Amino acid sequence: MSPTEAPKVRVTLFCILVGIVLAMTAVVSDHSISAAAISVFSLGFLIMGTICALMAFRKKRDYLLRPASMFYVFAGLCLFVSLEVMRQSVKRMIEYYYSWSFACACAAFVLLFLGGISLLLFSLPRMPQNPWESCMDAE
Amino acid sequence: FCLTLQNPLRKACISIVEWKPFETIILLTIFANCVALAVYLPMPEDDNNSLNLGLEKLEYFFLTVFSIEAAMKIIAGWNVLDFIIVFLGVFTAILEQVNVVKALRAFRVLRPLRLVSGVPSLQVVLNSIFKAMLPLFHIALLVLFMVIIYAIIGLELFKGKMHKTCYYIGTDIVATVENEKPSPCARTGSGRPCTINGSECRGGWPGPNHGITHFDNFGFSMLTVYQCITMEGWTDVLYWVNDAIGNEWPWIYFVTLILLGSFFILNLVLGVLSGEFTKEREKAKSR
Amino acid sequence: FYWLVILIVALNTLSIASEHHNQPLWLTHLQDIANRVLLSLFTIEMLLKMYGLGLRQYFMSIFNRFDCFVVCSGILELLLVESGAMTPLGISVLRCIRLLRLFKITKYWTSLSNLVASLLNSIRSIASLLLLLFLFIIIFALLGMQLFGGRYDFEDTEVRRSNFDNFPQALISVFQVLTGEDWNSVMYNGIMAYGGPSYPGVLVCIYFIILFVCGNYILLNVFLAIAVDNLAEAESLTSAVRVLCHRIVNATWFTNFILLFILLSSAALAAEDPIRAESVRNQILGYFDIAFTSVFTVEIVLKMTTYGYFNILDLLVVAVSLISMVVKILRVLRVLRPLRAINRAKGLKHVVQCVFVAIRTIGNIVLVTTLLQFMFACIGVQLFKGKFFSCNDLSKMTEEECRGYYYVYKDGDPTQMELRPRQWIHNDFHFDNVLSAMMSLFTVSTFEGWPQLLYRAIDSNEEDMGPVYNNRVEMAIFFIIYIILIAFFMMNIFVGFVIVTFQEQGDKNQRQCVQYALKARPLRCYIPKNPYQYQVWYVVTSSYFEYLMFALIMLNTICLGMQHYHHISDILNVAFTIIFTLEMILKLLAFKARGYFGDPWNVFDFLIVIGSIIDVILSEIDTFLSAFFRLFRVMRLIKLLSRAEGVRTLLWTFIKSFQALPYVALLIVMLFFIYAVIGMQMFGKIALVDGTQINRNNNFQTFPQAVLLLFRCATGEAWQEILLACSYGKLCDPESDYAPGEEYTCGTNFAYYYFISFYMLCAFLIINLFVAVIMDNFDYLTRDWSILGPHHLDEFKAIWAEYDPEAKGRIKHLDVTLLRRIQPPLG
Ligand SMILES: CCCCCCCCCCCCCCCCCC(=O)OC[C@H](COP(=O)([O-])OCC[N+](C)(C)C)OC(=O)CCCCCCCCCCCCCCCCC
Ligand SMILES: CCCCCCCCCCCCCCCCCC(=O)OC[C@H](COP(=O)(O)OCCN)OC(=O)CCCCCCCCCCCCCCCCC
Ligand SMILES: CCCCCCCCCCCCCCCCCC(=O)OC[C@H](COP(=O)(O)OCCN)OC(=O)CCCCCCCCCCCCCCCCC
Ligand SMILES: CCCCCCCCCCCCCCCCCC(=O)OC[C@H](COP(=O)(O)OCCN)OC(=O)CCCCCCCCCCCCCCCCC
Ligand SMILES: [Ca+2]
């Protein structure tokens, strides 16, 4: 409710799901050899993240919003790597440019990454800002 | 008080001047001896003029006067340091005659510390400085840990990049324009390619500052990190790494390092110092 | 009488500040007769007040004690100069002592006399600590003469003036290392003077680390005990039908949207290229600016339909866009959108007003600081007037001789020479007039480039000849007495003024525990049932396991430091990742993710674990057939401060205070944004020629490069060399527009007003952000750790949940048995 149904966390998750679907597109929308292993690893990270990110709402098992974000984060952090291995492959295998695939990937990286970081900071309890408060407190 | 601690009163006979103006003669001699160290003129690799050969003699006079002072003071905290000074002095003086030593003449510059140990109104100030050096412990630990983290980061990322610069083709002469410094180079990569007309970029180069500033091992990396923390020539390393390995990724390690050396170090240190000085004001006023 | 004396004092100050090199003869004929008539009128007024105040009223009044001094000194100088007075430096110093007469305007000024009394009290309190500092400097100068004395026996021809040959030069070099200017150049000479970057040679790099860490610690203990212990005492003693839109114009919709409508309208100038004003992107930015001005003229007309300070600011920023349509001045005066945000967020209002009152508080101390600078400038003009010329080759000592061509030998090799035309070059920062002298003293006061002026003043010859090697070694006293005052003293008391005022504007134990008493709450511990897993839980929380993890982390760090340049770093990392994943899985099994994802430190631990595993996987792929993914192994030591009781608390304190003033950090961001675009427009076409201070890494071409240059100038790098690298005559890069012949027209003297101002404001701002935090936490900074502190109450809070699993309000009265664990400071 408080960390699961607040407007900010809700819109951030709404942004990260669009990030995931654009990541799927940039994976399929094709426009050096390890560029596929990093991608399937990022996809598995997205699956492992959404597994616990869906079940975080129900049963009031809210704490699982903390690990989920990381997976999303890492998903992005994986895709970016592939991004570079594309760019370097252009300088490895004239005029070139970055068509649909690369632009969608460069958008999805920032969206997924910043959304996951913001989701982590919104799920993490609080910065005390007062001498009596502390992290890991009851409600 | 009221102790002999060595032997009965038959020995402590010469202790009659210790209450005389003795705090103005050995101090006067220490000030005359700290001036016999300023007029010494060091010459390159074992040369000497007359004045230095005269000071070498006068050093015997000074050592002997200090030793007889310690001899009229033994039979009667900082005197520990005074005896260490006299011990090092006599060690040096006998070693330089056994041969008939620079590491044994370097300790001769501790003599002016007897001048602070003389006046008592200065030892209270020195003690205040030492006592105020205490509450900075957590800040010191944080600075050490941060320097260590950044040294390790730089050691991972830039380990062995700054080792190429365009010499002249068939020559071992680094090619620079008039006012340039020998910055690194890179061929067929991201790094800057140079444009001196008869120049080629080939490896086998010690480093930018004759091999002093680079990230090869942990030592030189920690040195470069400490130097960048003092905000002196950090743009030089930024450029030597922002034009020899890329140009849009090595700007983070340095800018952040500054913001963690500019913001936090100064803020924390000035804060704790002002706090301790406030507590000093209160303990001096409320009485 | 005050105006009666201020007229003549101001006229004398004008006659002083009228002098300069190459002045016409009539200017000297005016200055000398003005000195004569003003000395005679000073005599007249002295004798008038003597006959009118009694003989025994001019030798005890300190305020007017040295006017007899003034007149007698003027007479002495007159009679000494009127005779045969050789050594033009003698005339120079005789006119230097003349400059004392301008102190009557400071003495009659009562507040200035009170300030003199305050400063003299401070310095007479800190004289002993200053003596100790001076003695430490002498000890280190002697140690330097021992180590590097005569060891600069370099076979090459580069000059190294900051050496340790004799005692005055050792003192100068030690002072230069102390003030932290160019000290990293005096270290490389001391290194290469020994073997080099070898094992026994680099060990001399610790003479310059002790001298700068413990030589700047004393220096801060001195000049900050003058501003919390004698400057604070001064203040202490001083104490004793137009409604269709009137509905939403106040709603969060309109305001929250017109706020974000600027942060993207400002970015219309960021994404800009100034070399060619017409390309495929500037058209798009102009098209966006059409909307970015229309959707704001709509705003201002929607404001005007309802009504008739800041509204006029918005009006001007929206009226300049209509005339966006001389020609290069309007384009510069169009970045005004970032300013008109103070009346919208209502967060910048308070910070702008507090800093505009902080400027108000500071005024009587800055007046004398700018007078001292103006004072020293006149002394410099008397000393180094015109002596800063120098030929191209140091063998020609006159402008008549410095012509033709000469030889330049590369690497000092007498068989590899080139021809270069010699030229009588006037130094960049000189002392010809009080304006240039004030500029040079300004650059000296910021410590950037002061040795290059010191070794030029030392070499000064006559009044129009080339520099003689070490001519005057006693010329460094003027550069050491000015850096010890204005650049050391005044600045440290000016910061004390602010600091002390913050405390005033910013018993006590009872005013925090009450909040801690009623606003606190019990704590969580997550003590689990079902001994099946409690078995591993008891060791998971045990102390020796955390000691083992401490040891393993330290071992990981030592193994990470062992690496060097030119296969033991590939497998030990796998072993460490395995052990830490074991730790993760274990602590996950003894908490069931319920108490694992409660503590933020385990949240961070899981991140590190997954990152390191992914790193190992990518390294496996690398070895089968992402440099930054290895940073996750060095992050493993950041969790070393899970046991840092006094360091984690300090970070908490000094982090929860950077989130209380995010607006004072918005002022600096607005300053950088406003100055970067002005820089890009004014000096943006200068060619990037290597060897000059505007090169491929330091330029105004793009926006990030401009911001990086501004950061370099802020942090205190060689900004006065950039200031001369972008001033009216640099080569325009070819991709710009210029008629054949109009090529050397890039840059403009406006640079002098651009950089100086930026170094003032920024400095000022960097003070506020630094003190606004220091005043924010004067609770923690001044906390007696013996009487009562929230450390005691946090200990009590943690001991409470030791017996109480969950909150459940209070517990049974039996756990009185825990009251025997609290301390007398609490019970
Ligand atoms: C108790 C200690 C407290 C202090 C510690 C807290 C802060 C920790 C230090 C911050 C990390 C330093 C920044 C990383 C440096 C990256 C620069 C770089 O990689 O350049 C060369 C490398 C060179 O790699 P490369 O792949 O370009 O090399 C050549 C490539 N080819 C072959 C194509 C030519 O650049 C990269 O690695 C590319 C990645 C770009 C961005 C990666 C860096 C991300 C870092 C995350 C920031 C962490 C936030 C800080 C935490 C908060 C602290 C305030
Ligand atoms: C009393 C007031 C304060 C006192 C502070 C005292 C600080 C003393 C500084 C200690 C410096 C390290 C001492 C040990 C050096 C050992 C050098 C060594 O073992 O080998 C040389 C080293 C690496 O090997 P190398 O010889 O270069 O190999 C080349 C081919 N053989 O090559 C090297 O160049 C290694 C040199 C590295 C030196 C880096 C030191 C910088 C540390 C900065 C921390 C300062 C932070 C201050 C915090 C205090 C808070 C107020
Ligand atoms: C209150 C605290 C105040 C602090 C006081 C201390 C201040 C001075 C600190 C300066 C320390 C600098 C020491 C310099 C060591 C440099 C080691 C070196 O010279 O080279 C690295 C060496 C491999 O290099 P190389 O010699 O090239 O190998 C073959 C030959 N080429 O291989 C190595 O040497 C690697 C070994 C170093 C790696 C260590 C990793 C970090 C360890 C720190 C853990 C905790 C720190 C200590 C705790 C202090 C708190 C009390
Ligand atoms: C908690 C309170 C804190 C208070 C803060 C106090 C103020 C501190 C602010 C200091 C920040 C300094 C900014 C330094 C980063 C600037 C970016 C940079 O310097 O990289 C240069 C590089 C340009 O390279 P290139 O594009 O190749 O140019 C030639 C064409 N090849 O760039 C690149 O090519 C790569 C792309 C880089 C762009 C992304 C980074 C953002 C750039 C704008 C930074 C922010 C600007 C706004 C002002 C911030 C300052 C407040
Ligand atoms: Ca500098």
From Swiss-Prot, chain A:
It is a multi-pass membrane protein. Coiled coil: none annotated. Gene3D superfamilies: 1.20.140.150. The keyword Disulfide bond applies. N-glycosylated. GO terms for molecular function: calcium channel regulator activity; voltage-gated calcium channel activity. One of its GO terms (biological process) is calcium ion transmembrane transport. Keywords: Calcium, Calcium channel, Calcium transport, Cell membrane, Disulfide bond, Glycoprotein, Ion channel, Ion transport, Membrane, Transmembrane, Transmembrane helix, Transport, Voltage-gated channel. Residues 84-99 are extracellular. The keyword Ion transport applies. It is found in: Cell membrane, Sarcolemma. The chain crosses the membrane at residues 11-29, 37-57, 63-83, 100-124. Residues 1-10, 58-62, 125-139 are cytoplasmic. Skeletal muscle (at protein level). Regulatory subunit of the voltage-gated calcium channel that gives rise to L-type calcium currents in skeletal muscle. Regulates channel inactivation kinetics. Belongs to the PMP-22/EMP/MP20 family. CACNG subfamily. Component of a calcium channel complex consisting of a pore-forming alpha subunit (CACNA1S) and the ancillary subunits CACNB1 or CACNB2, CACNG1 and CACNA2D1. The channel complex contains alpha, beta, gamma and delta subunits in a 1:1:1:1 ratio, i.e. it contains either CACNB1 or CACNB2. This is Voltage-dependent calcium channel gamma-1 subunit.
From Swiss-Prot, chain C:
GO terms for biological process: calcium ion import across plasma membrane; calcium ion transmembrane transport; cellular response to caffeine; muscle contraction; positive regulation of muscle contraction; regulation of ryanodine-sensitive calcium-release channel activity; release of sequestered calcium ion into cytosol. It comes from the Eukaryota. Residues 169-190, 435-455, 706-724 dip into the membrane without crossing it. IV repeats lie at residues 530-778. Disulfide bonds join C391-C402, C732-C746. II repeats lie at residues 1-231. Its main location: membrane. A motif (Selectivity filter of repeat II) lies at residues 179-182. A motif (Selectivity filter of repeat IV) lies at residues 715-718. The chain crosses the membrane at residues 1-18, 30-50, 62-81, 91-109, 129-148, 201-220, 253-271, 284-303, 309-325, 327-345, 365-384, 473-494, 544-565, 568-589, 600-619, 626-644, 663-683, 751-775. One of its GO terms (molecular function) is transmembrane transporter binding. Changing R511H: Shifts the threshold potential to more negative values and lowers the concentration threshold for channel activation by caffeine. Pore-forming, alpha-1S subunit of the voltage-gated calcium channel that gives rise to L-type calcium currents in skeletal muscle. Calcium channels containing the alpha-1S subunit play an important role in excitation-contraction coupling in skeletal muscle via their interaction with RYR1, which triggers Ca(2+) release from the sarcplasmic reticulum and ultimately results in muscle contraction. Long-lasting (L-type) calcium channels belong to the 'high-voltage activated' (HVA) group. Component of a calcium channel complex consisting of a pore-forming alpha subunit (CACNA1S) and the ancillary subunits CACNB1 or CACNB2, CACNG1 and CACNA2D1. The channel complex contains alpha, beta, gamma and delta subunits in a 1:1:1:1 ratio, i.e. it contains either CACNB1 or CACNB2. CACNA1S channel activity is modulated by the auxiliary subunits (CACNB1 or CACNB2, CACNG1 and CACNA2D1). Interacts with DYSF and JSRP1. Interacts with RYR1. Interacts with STAC, STAC2 and STAC3 (via their SH3 domains). Interaction with STAC3 promotes expression at the cell membrane. This is Voltage-dependent L-type calcium channel subunit alpha-1S. The gene is CACNA1S.
